[PDB]
Amino acid sequence: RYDSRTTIFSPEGRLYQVEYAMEAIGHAGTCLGILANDGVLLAAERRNIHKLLDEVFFSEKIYKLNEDMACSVAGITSDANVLTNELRLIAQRYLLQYQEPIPCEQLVTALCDIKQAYTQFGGKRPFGVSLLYIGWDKHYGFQLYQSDPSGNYGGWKATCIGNNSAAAVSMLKQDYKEGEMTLKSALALAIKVLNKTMDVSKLSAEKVEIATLTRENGKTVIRVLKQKEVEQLIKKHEEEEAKAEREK
Amino acid sequence: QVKEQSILELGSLLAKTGQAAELGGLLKYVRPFLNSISKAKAARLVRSLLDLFLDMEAATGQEVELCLECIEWAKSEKRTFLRQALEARLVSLYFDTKRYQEALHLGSQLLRELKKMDDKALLVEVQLLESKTYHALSNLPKARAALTSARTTANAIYCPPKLQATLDMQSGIIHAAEEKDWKTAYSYFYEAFEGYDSIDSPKAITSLKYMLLCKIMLNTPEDVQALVSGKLALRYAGRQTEALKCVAQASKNRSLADFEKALTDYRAELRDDPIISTHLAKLYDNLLEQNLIRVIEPFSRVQIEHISSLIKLSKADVERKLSQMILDKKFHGILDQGEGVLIIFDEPPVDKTYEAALETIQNMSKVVDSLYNKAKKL
Amino acid sequence: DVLPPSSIMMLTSDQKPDVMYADIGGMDIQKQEVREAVELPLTHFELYKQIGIDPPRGVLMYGPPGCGKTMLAKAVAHHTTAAFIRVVGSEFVQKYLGEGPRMVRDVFRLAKENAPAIIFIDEIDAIATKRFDAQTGADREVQRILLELLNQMDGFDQNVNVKVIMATNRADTLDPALLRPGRLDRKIEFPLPDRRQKRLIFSTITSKMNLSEEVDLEDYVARPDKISGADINSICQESGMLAVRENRYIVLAKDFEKAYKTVIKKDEQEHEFYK
Amino acid sequence: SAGFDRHITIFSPEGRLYQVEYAFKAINQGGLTSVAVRGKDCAVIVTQKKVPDKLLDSSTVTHLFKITENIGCVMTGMTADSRSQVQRARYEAANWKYKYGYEIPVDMLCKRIADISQVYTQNAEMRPLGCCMILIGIDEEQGPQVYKCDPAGYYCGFKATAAGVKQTESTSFLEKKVKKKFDWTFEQTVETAITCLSTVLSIDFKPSEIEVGVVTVENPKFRILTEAEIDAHLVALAE
Amino acid sequence: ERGYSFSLTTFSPSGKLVQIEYALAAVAGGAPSVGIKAANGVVLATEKKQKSILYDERSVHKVEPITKHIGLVYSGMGPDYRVLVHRARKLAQQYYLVYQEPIPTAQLVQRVASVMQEYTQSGGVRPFGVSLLICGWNEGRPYLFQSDPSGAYFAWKATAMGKNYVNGKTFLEKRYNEDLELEDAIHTAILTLKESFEGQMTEDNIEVGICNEAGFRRLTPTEVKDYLAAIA
Amino acid sequence: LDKQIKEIKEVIELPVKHPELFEALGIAQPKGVLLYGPPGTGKTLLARAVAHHTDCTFIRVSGSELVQKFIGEGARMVRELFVMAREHAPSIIFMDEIDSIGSSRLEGGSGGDSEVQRTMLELLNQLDGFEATKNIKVIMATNRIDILDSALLRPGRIDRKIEFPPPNEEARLDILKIHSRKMNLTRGINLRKIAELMPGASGAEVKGVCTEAGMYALRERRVHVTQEDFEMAVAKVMQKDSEKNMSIKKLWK
Amino acid sequence: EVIELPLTNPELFQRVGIIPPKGCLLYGPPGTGKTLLARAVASQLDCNFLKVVSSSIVDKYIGESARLIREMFNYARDHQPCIIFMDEIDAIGGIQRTLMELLNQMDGFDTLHRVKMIMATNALLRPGRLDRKIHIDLPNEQARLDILKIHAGPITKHGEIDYEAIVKLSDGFNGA
Ligand SMILES: Nc1ncnc2c1ncn2[C@@H]1O[C@H](COP(=O)(O)OP(=O)(O)O)[C@@H](O)[C@H]1O
Ligand SMILES: Nc1ncnc2c1ncn2[C@@H]1O[C@H](COP(=O)(O)OP(=O)(O)O)[C@@H](O)[C@H]1O
Ligand SMILES: Nc1ncnc2c1ncn2[C@@H]1O[C@H](COP(=O)(O)OP(=O)(O)O)[C@@H](O)[C@H]1O
Ligand SMILES: [Mg+2]
Ligand SMILES: [Mg+2]
């Protein structure tokens, strides 16, 4: 076989270790982000919902990187923590040298370069962490970026990674109205997608985490929705489902 | 905080004095005080005072009336948990007063409320009360089902030593009622006895008595002496354990006279407990049957007086037992009251040949009927 | 003329395991489940017909070793009026590919011929592992054996009147196909005895033993040590043998305590740092 | 299962490190036994002194090494690795004295030894030192102390102990002895240690086959008992 | 997939770091440890059994302090725990020196998790075979985190690690109420140790530590004896 | 499984009952059909049903019946099976658990099974080789469709691969009705609620729930099963074994 | 102490209740007289004294049983007391689960004519799986003299022959 180490090339020319990591990224919990005309948002699923687990951070899957960036996570916990720490370090280093916020894509490219270096040099296992990026910059404004274990990123309007990523992405493609989504509509679509992306019915508020990026008076406030508004959105989706079934 | 403790002490003193009317007056006066205090504390205070009121032997007939007044007042004050606790205590009181039907209906009504609600300890207590009331009414299958549900709900929450002891004792009672496996009944009764001893509850002596009765029922009377003179059982020695010991000795010697003397002497400790009374009566019936069968083996036309003297029993009692035994396809024979004897024969088999012949006759009759159906075509 | 008709196991009338349900100490729930699944249907099929429920065809006892699974199997064998066949999972795995599945189908065909019958596959944990993408012939042989067993149990040719009993110790590494409601309807757990089943086991094992007045088995039952029924039987046998060694025909408290201390000791080395 | 016992940093399927256990077993290759008994005011250790050759120099074979005037050690197992660990322990004690002033307590001394062993076991660079390191020494405010701390990196406080081929038997004998609370005196401690070794080995214990080292509160300096003292203790033990 | 159960720097076809799972199994195969977080403080308890009466129960302590307001109990390989505790103390003191404020439980736990993960990225270094359980009282709110060899850290309200951890977790969620106090938390922790404890629970065999606002302190055999007698 | 039943009958019934339709259409008669899906979905049940309404020889072959020990016994057995099926033509050959023989082909060497490979090659030639079978349709049911080598799963040896997804809500209700026909249900036994309580039932777990409700009824010694009994049966038969170790579950954030 | 009490007084064993004393083991150095121990103890009874050393009883899987497990007890009963002597169990078929089932079968169910299995080679050590285990010490030099005397008896020697200093220079540690 040709998967003993990352450096080994298969005869067909495939980094088997990188493909294995990109397949394993599916074990991670579901996370998604919809880009809206007034902002972008992220949605994550708390796989661990045990009653004995105390929620102390409320941001297990959604981390703040800079004053105008945030990136969700999906993959190994240790790799995710290392990647988020490196992201913060890169963003603050760029701020110190240039004295302006990183234009999002710079941070994405830096992290992708780190991951590529890991997937190239021998003796290092590929970072099995695929993390969505959100943020606003003076050059392009709101953007959502996808990072894979192979360092291949890409601009995206709405994507989901982790469990049942294929179904969530497909039905986001089916019902995403380009250039006509507002943050409220974006949250509604995100809740609709998360409802069937996970097997758990009723989309418990404690089992879903949503963070939204907004551009208010030139501040770029990152807001993590409190349980109250999450419950309100869940109830709204339930009423919408009842209205839809009314046709039946 | 001081007021609650002072009221508890005053209620304890009054219950010592048996001033039930004064206790009710204090409860009604303090009614507003609960609104000025926390809900859980007020509910606990009301429950403690109500339990103290029922503890006194002053069963003047106003106990159920006071319980109903308290439950209605709690419903008025909108304390769901307090109302459920009061209903559970009322069900227990109905059991103690032997008004099972009302207790059964109230428990059935409250079971759904406790099932939807998350307070599973009161649910376990109420299910155990319903199982006990079902057993008291002879509905053993439903009682066992209720006890199984109670055990299932108990192995999902913290079962304090008292609740565990009650569950074990009730399930041992249910197992004993099903007179098929007495070893498990003894094991459950021992578990309940240990649980009660660790709490010093008065029901430890009852558990010990049931343990001794289970030991007796297994045709092993000798173990009673060892059990009574044990490390934990010694402190409970007294009239009740001695009565069980005497009954065990009587069963060991297998003498009906000793059993009757033991029952007559320790009437309070043996006939006032329904489980002990019923099971000891069944054991007495079994012992009498075995002794009578043993004493008629040599005889073929034994006169009733001699057999009664051999068994050391009244002539009428032995006559009735022999009649019942014959009427139930037990030892074969027929009595003749004209002079009095118990004739025994060998019960000719049945001559299966005649049964086969009759069955063949029926088959051929129906074949002739079929030929009647035929022959219609000429 | 036509001449009238043991083979592998075909437990014979003189080969009965000789263990009565009373000997099995304190397994009321498991006893009842095993009777409902493997014994009652053979006798009381009228209740199943009245409810029309197609009585369960397989039972999988799982739990810590020495808890009493094999004794329950033996008791069902001795208390049963149907042909009892006992096989061990290690037997199926053989060389000469085509003999494992061949023996499995031979056992099932034997059960079918003389029915009703009970097939006991003890330690089926050997050929029960979650079927993985086998990449070697030896790896694929065990999967073939498992496939043959699955096809025989719930397959095109329904057995009817044969019940399959299996005993393992993991119960979570088993192939999800075997634990399907149609092959192993009931999964009876055999937890290590608690303060109760321990007392019943002690009383049942000690019932035959001579014992002595000063020996109070309750002293040992309440001890917090977690010991299986096999451990209790070993403790009783060791206490009796210690009593016999000292030329004493009566077992006393000192011998029982010494035997209990000896049996409870199971750490061995443990190397002192794993813990 | 058995394919994971070729590297020290690879975990076994059940959660075990096989190489550490293998080194533990290798401890017994020397074929010797050592026992330590902690008395009320003394700490005594006795180890076998095997000289299976008339040309050997009995003075150069002693296994009792003095790490410091106040702390003592007896190496059991492989000779070369035991001597290397003894040298490392001497270095550790010297560095502790040089950096903190007060003499390093025995517990700390071979806790450092055990940390070195563990760092060896974690990073797969060197074979773990297959030699049990038994430490003794009087510690102010804590009386006599004997600490056994081994290749895998485990150190514990011991009232009595032993390392070598006959370790389980010696520890069982000590457990049978340590339980009858009695005056743990210097003479009593030495007698109990020698008796345990004699019963475990089932040998008459000629004076030239044993080597003893004792540290006492009255004289808190490692002393290696000579032949005369050992013989006197043995004669007292017999009668 | 037996071929990839050897190296920690290679990905299995399904995407499992096999060695990390094996290290977690080795951790779960160690000594029991249970900790409960009360509204007033935190409780940490581990069962300290030596193989014979010949071991000084007081020489090695499973519960050790990292700072004036951080604790540590483990379940697994003790020699690895010693290095873990040394690194935790160094990290806490580095944070104190740089910021002159006692390191918050969250940050010390995160840095300990980073230290753990440092060993699970290169061949030739065995993952830490011990899962730490950290107490704490920072900003007037009791904390309890568990750091694993995989590097992940959580905020356990109350959990039991090591041998018989399933039974301990089942016992929890039953006797645990979110509005307890330090004494009730200690009683619950002692009971949880009991349900997974073989033999008599002597004062020298069970080691516990309260970590309330006053700080982390290892209960001396006297207090443990009093508590066990009260429960017993 | 109405769609699945019709699809299977299109190959097992239509080609043999009315070959003239295919002769006129100008298409070759489909020969084989493969059933694959989650365990206990109803593949063997459909095979038995086809064996019922078949009016045609329905030779059965289990997973390990063609393995055999002596080399060349598997190939000979397959050849005799196909010769007998042709002699009794028309015929349907059901190969339950084709995963046993027919797995993905492995190289030589000690690891490879080899012999089962030879039997599978014999079967492959028989189903599509120099001699074309006439009036012999093969139904093979096997989970793990992806492991079968890409020669037995070629669109000439296996024409129709009918999937057997775990029954949906209406499918679960229909299965409950099918297996509860002979049961003594009690008024207020709404089966839609029970089906809603089974989100992803294998299909046979529905029968397991019915049997567990019947067993509860027997244990209580009644002859009617109530709704609470069905709910308990769902809670029992649908037991799931989670990780139970938060350490492993937290590895993947 | 292991084969005499069970043979002589089964009543005392049955009086106490513990019937099966079977098991036993003689792990130690290879062939230092292991068979002889089962021979010297054959002073009384031990008539058949069969040997099945690592062969015919499990054969890895079950290869040997009844016709290779019962036929044993068979003559082991149709005759005077005997010893199964399943010596060298460390070479059976060269499996552990079969052996565990091997030692927990009807073997102890009958235990005919007080026949005790005396396996000897190098949680299966508990009662019912393996009885008293004895480790044979390496031939003691003081015992080595005993061996040289008995072993060297038959060979025609002369009077000056001394079996005294040989052991001092002869510590081979093997009986052969
Ligand atoms: N309830 C019990 N009563 C008596 N002995 C028991 C009991 N449970 C276990 N034992 C002991 O263990 C044996 C049964 O354990 P077994 O079923 O063989 O365990 P396993 O199935 O794990 O092999 C008995 O022969 C006896 O030695
Ligand atoms: N769609 C369905 N309709 C009716 N019964 C079903 C259905 N799915 C599963 N079953 C039941 O589940 C059981 C599974 O048996 P089987 O057909 O052998 O499953 P599989 O095909 O997975 O091997 C059958 O007895 C059948 O009665
Ligand atoms: N202590 C001894 N006493 C008498 N003979 C011995 C002794 N040790 C070895 N022997 C000789 O060695 C042989 C015994 O070998 P044995 O121990 O049976 O080998 P194994 O253990 O492989 O069966 C006998 O021929 C015997 O003469
Ligand atoms: Mg077994
Ligand atoms: Mg099938």
The beta-carbon neighbor of A47 closest among F199, F200, F249 is F249
Q: Is C68 in the pocket of ligand 1 (CB under 6 A)?
A: yes
Q: Which residues of E103-115 are buried (b: 16+ CB within 10 A; e: fewer)?
A: bbbbebbbbbbbb
Give the closest residue to D43 by CA, choosing from D174, D227, D223: D223
Q: Is C183 in the pocket of ligand 2 (CB under 6 A)?
A: no
Q: What percent of chain A is helix, strand and coil (3-state, nearest 5)?
A: 40, 20, 40
Chain F neighbors of C50, CB-CB under 8 A: 184, 223
- Phi, psi dihedral angles at D45 (to 5 degrees): -135, 135
The shares of helix, strand and coil residues in chain C, as percent rounded to the nearest 5, are: 45, 10, 45
Residue type for A65, please?
L
Q: Supply B190's token pair.
A: 């021992």
A31, A42, A48: best to mutate for the F interface, most F CBs within 10 A? A48
Among G27, G34, G35, which residue has the most ligand 3 atoms within 8 Å of its CB, making it the best to mutate? G35
CA nearest neighbour of D189 among D39, D32, D31: D39
Q: Is residue B354 in a domain? A: no
C-alpha dist (Å) from residue C131 to C128, D69, F144, F147: 8, 65, 10, 12
The CATH number covering residue B171 comes to: 1.25.40.570
| G119 within 8 A of G87, measured Cβ to Cβ | yes
- Please count the helices (runs of H) and the strands (runs of E) in chain C: 11, 4
Phi and psi angles of residue E9, each rounded to the nearest 5 degrees, phi first: -105, 15
**Pseudo-torsion of CA B168, B169, B171, B172, nearest 10°?**
110
Q: What is the residue type of A131?
A: L
As given in the structure block, the two tokens for residue C115 are 């029915």
Exposure letters G70-94 (e unless 16+ CB within 10 A, then b): eebbeebbeeebbbbbbbbbeebbe
E37 and E161 Cβ atoms separated by less than 8 Å: no
Domain membership of residue B142 (yes or no) is: yes
Q: Helix B80-97 to helix B100-116 angle, to the nearest 10 degrees?
A: 150
Distance C87 CA to ligand 5 centre (A): 23
Query: What six digits make up the tokens of C155?
Result: 């397959």
Q: Given strand A62-66, what is the order of strands in its sheet?
A: A62-66, A69-72, A132-137, A141-146, A154-155
- Three-class SS state of C60: strand
Between positions 41 and 100 of A, the ones with CB within 8 A of F are: 47-48, 50, 53, 60-61, 73-77, 80
Helix (H) or strand (E) holding B88: helix B80-97
Cβ neighbours of F249 in E, within 8 Å: none
Question: CA A54 to CA A49: how far, in whole Å?
Answer: 9
Phi, psi of A142 (to 5 degrees): -65, 135
The SS3 call for residue E70 is strand
CA angle G161, G166, G171 (to 5 degrees): 155
What 3-state DSSP class applies to D64? strand
CB A17 within 8 A of CB A126: yes
Residue E214 CB contacts under 8 Å (≥ 6 apart), including other chains? none
Determine, for residues E24 and F253 on separate chains, whether the beta-carbon distance falls below 8 Å: no
Ligand closest in space to the Cα of F173 = 2
Q: How many domains does chain A have?
A: 1
Domain total of chain B:
1
**What tokens were used for G33?**
């007289």
CA distances from F171 to F40, F207, F234 (A): 14, 13, 16
Range of the domain at A130: 1-246
**Ligand 2 pocket, residue C154 CB under 6 Å:** yes
* DSSP label at residue B238: S
What is the dihedral sign for C-alpha B5, B10, B16, B20?
negative
G133 is in an annotated binding site: no
Other Cβ atoms closer than 10 A to D31:
12
| Tokens found for residue B125 | 């207590």
CA distance A169 to A161: 8
N- to C-terminal Cα separation, chain E:
49
User: Residue E32: which of F243, C275, D154, F250 has the closest Cα?
Assistant: C275
- Is chain A adjacent to chain G, meaning 3+ CB pairs within 8 angstroms? no
Residue B194 belongs to what H/E stretch?
helix B182-197
Q: How far is CA D156 from CA D216, E204, G75, in A?
A: 21, 14, 57
Atom of ligand 2 nearest to the CA of F1: 1
Of E218, E53, G25, C74, the closest CA to residue D175 belongs to: E53
Regarding the beta carbon of C162 and ligand 1, being less than 6 Å apart is answered: no
- CB of D205 closer than 8 Å to CB of D234: yes
Nearest to E24 among F244, F248, F253 (CB): F248
The CB-based long-range contact list for A199-205 (8 Å cut-off, 24+ gap) reads A199/F199, A199/F200, A201/F199, A202/A234, A202/A238, A203/A234, A203/A237, A204/A49, A204/A234, A205/A230, A205/A231, A205/A234
Phi, psi of E98 (to 5 degrees): -70, -35
- Other beta carbons within 10 angstroms of residue C18's beta carbon come to 12
Q: Which of C193, C181, C148, C197 is nearest to C60 (CA)?
A: C181
- Residue pair B314/B297 in contact (Cβ under 8 Å)? The answer is no
Looking at the domain assignment, is residue B262 inside a domain?
A: yes
Q: How far is CA F180 from the centre of its chain?
A: 22
Half-sphere exposure of F188 (CA within 13 A, CB side): 4
Cα–Cα distance measured from residue E133 to residue E84, given in angstroms and rounded to the nearest whole number: 11
Alpha carbons A181 and B207: distance in angstroms, whole number = 72
Query: Which chain A residues are Cβ-neighbours of E16 within 8 angstroms?
Result: 24
Cβ partners under 8 Å of residue B35, min gap 6: B42, B77
DSSP E163-228: TTHHHHHHHTTTS--TT--HHHHHHHHHHHHHHT--S---TTTEEEEEEETTEEEE--HHHHHHHH
**Cα end-to-end distance, chain B, whole Å:** 107
Among D206, D195, D190, D211, residue whose Cα is nearest residue D63: D211
What angle in degrees, to the nearest 10, is found between the helix axes of B239-253 and B274-296? 20
Using a CB-CB cut-off of 8 Å, the residues of chain F touching A53 are 246
CB atoms within 10 A of CB A185: 15
| Cα C181 to chain centroid, rounded | 20
d(CA F9, CA F15): 9
Chain C touched by E1 (CB under 8 Å): yes
Helices (H), strands (E): how many in chain G? 8, 0
Rounded to 10 degrees, what is the CA torsion of C219, C220, C224, C225? 170
Give the start-end residues of each E strand in F74-222. Answer: 91-96, 136-141, 160-163
Residues in chain F with CB shorter than 8 Å from the CB of B145 are 220
Tokens standing for F210? 């019915």
What is the domain extent for residue B270? 1-343
Return binding residues of C. 63-70
Write down the residue that tokens 């050759």 correspond to: D53
Query: B177: helix, coil or strand?
Result: helix
Residues D114 and E79 sit within 8 Å (Cβ to Cβ): yes
Among the listed residues D130, D132, D174, D139, the one whose alpha carbon sits nearest the alpha carbon of residue D155: D132
Torsion over CA: B144, B150, B154, B159 (sign): negative
| DSSP-based three-state secondary structure for G104 | coil
Contact F183, F144 (CB under 8 A): no
Residue B149 vs residues B123, E177, F238, F240: alpha-carbon distances, Å: 10, 24, 20, 22
Q: Which of C132, D15, A80 lies closest to E18 in space, CA to CA?
A: D15
φ/ψ of F13, rounded to 5, equals -115, -55
Helix (H, G, I), strand (E, B) or coil at F185: strand
Are the CB atoms for F28 and F15 separated by under 8 Å?
Answer: no
Q: Under a CB-based contact definition with an 8 Å cutoff, are residues C89 and C128 in contact?
A: yes
Query: Would you say residue B206 lies in a domain?
Result: yes
Is the CB of residue F115 less than 8 Å from the CB of residue F67?
yes
Token match 């004995």: residue? A52
CA of F35 to the centre of ligand 5 (A): 10
> Taking the domains of chain D in order of start, what are their residue ranges?
1-239
Residue D145, φ and ψ in degrees, nearest 5: -140, 130
User: By the 8 A CB rule, do C30 and C157 touch?
Assistant: no
- Which residues lie across from A135 on neighbouring strands? A69, A143
Q: Measuring CA to CA, how many Å separate E120 from each of A124, E20, E23, E155?
A: 10, 8, 10, 22
Residues of chain C contacting D156 with CB distance shorter than 8 Å? 272
Q: In a 10 Å sphere around its CB, with 0-12 CB exposed, 13-18 middle and 19+ buried, how is residue G160 labelled?
A: exposed
Q: Is E139 exposed, middle or buried (0-12, 13-18, 19+ CB in 10 A)?
A: exposed
B161-177 vs B140-154: helix axis angle to the nearest 10? Answer: 150
| CA distance linking residue C129 with residue C80, whole number of Å | 30
Q: For residue A56, give the CATH number of its domain.
A: 3.60.20.10
d(CA C32, CA C25): 13
Rounded Cα distance, B52 and B11, in Å = 7
For the CA of F47, the nearest ligand: 2
Give the method used: cryo-EM
Q: How far apart are CA D176 and CA F150, in angstroms?
A: 71
Q: Is C193 in the pocket of ligand 1 (CB under 6 A)?
A: no
DSSP structural state of residue A42: E
In angstroms, the separation between the Cα of residue C210 and the nearest Cα of chain G is: 5
Domains of chain E: 2-231 (3.60.20.10)
Pairwise CA distance, residues F203 & A70, whole Å:
44
Q: What is the distance between the alpha carbons of residues B323 and G150, in angstroms, rounded to a whole number?
A: 86
Can you tell me the distance from the alpha carbon of G121 to that of G90, in angstroms, rounded to the nearest whole number? Answer: 6
In the structure, how many helices (H) and strands (E) does chain D have?
Answer: 6, 10
Contact assessment for residue C92 and residue C100, using Cβ atoms and an 8 Å cutoff: yes
Q: Using an 8 Å Cβ cutoff, are E113 and A81 in contact?
A: yes
Paired residues of C166 in beta bridges: C60, C121
- Both tokens of A181, joined, read 């989504």
CB A69 within 8 A of CB A91: yes
To which H or E segment does residue E36 belong?
strand E33-37
Candidate from F199, F200, F249 with C-beta closest to A48:
F249
DSSP secondary-structure letter at C256? H
Q: ∠ at Cα C78 (C72, C84), nearest 5°?
A: 90
> At residue E69, what are phi and psi to the nearest 5 degrees?
-135, 40
* Inside any domain, residue B376: no
A 32-51 residues with CB < 8 A to F: 47-48, 50
- CA A68 and chain centroid, separation: 15
Query: What torsion, rounded to 10 degrees, do the Cα atoms F44, F47, F49, F53 define?
Result: -170
For C176-231, the three-class secondary structure string (H helix, E strand, C coil) is CCCCCCCCCCECCECCCCCCCHHHHHHHHHHHHCCCCCCCCHHHHHCCCCCCCHHH
CA distance E50 to chain A (A): 31
Ligand 3 center to G174 CA (angstroms):
9
Q: Cβ distance D25 to D52 under 8 Å?
A: no
Q: Which of B76, C144, G92 is nearest to F96 (CA)?
A: C144
Q: How far apart are CA F234 and CA F41, in angstroms?
A: 17
**Spatial separation of the C-alpha atoms in residues E132 and G39, rounded to whole Å:** 59
Residue F161, beta-bridge partner list: F34
User: Of chain F residues 162-191, which have a CB less than 8 A from chain E?
Assistant: none
Residue B104 in any domain: the answer is: yes
Q: How many CB atoms lie within 10 A of CB D111?
A: 21
Name which of C102, C156, C172 is nearest F47 (Cβ-Cβ): C156
DSSP-H helix ranges across chain E: 18-28, 78-99, 105-118, 165-171, 182-195, 221-231
Q: What is the third-level CATH fold of D1-239?
A: Glutamine Phosphoribosylpyrophosphate, subunit 1, domain 1 (3.60.20)
Q: Does E199 touch chain C (CB under 8 A)?
A: yes
Q: How far apart are CA E152 and CA C91, in angstroms?
A: 44
